[PDB]
């Protein structure tokens, strides 16, 4: 019947741009060798599972843009703690 003003500004392509931000959090810097790494295989599928969970969290394209920052933000700084996990 009806639905939130969701699709208004998410679009199919424009939405793909946001998905990359989720993957950049775990790996901001470029890594041509990572693409060959089996670990990367999980990165894609992983983001695909969470992204769907991140998108739904928003009842509007606006909220979706905010929650996205928190995820990438927390994960962005979290990378620092992971480095000291072995020193």
């Amino acid at each position: 019947g009806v639905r939130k003003g969701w699709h208004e500004h998410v679009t199919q392509d424009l939405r793909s741009h946001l998905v990359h931000k989720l993957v950049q959090a775990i790996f901001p810097t470029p890594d041509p060798a990572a693409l060959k790494d089996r670990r990367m295989e999980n990165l894609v599928a992983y983001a695909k599972k969470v992204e769907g969970d991140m998108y739904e969290s928003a009842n509007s394209r606006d909220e979706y843009y905010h929650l996205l920052a928190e995820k990438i933000y927390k994960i962005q700084k979290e990378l620092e703690e992971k480095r000291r996990s072995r020193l």
Binding site: T29, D31, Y46, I75, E78, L79, S85
Partner: peptide, 19 residues
Amino acid sequence: GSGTDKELSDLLDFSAMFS
């Protein structure tokens, strides 16, 4: 729905090792 993330820590560990 969801729970604790295990691979999430392994994914970051990969990038954490290199630059």
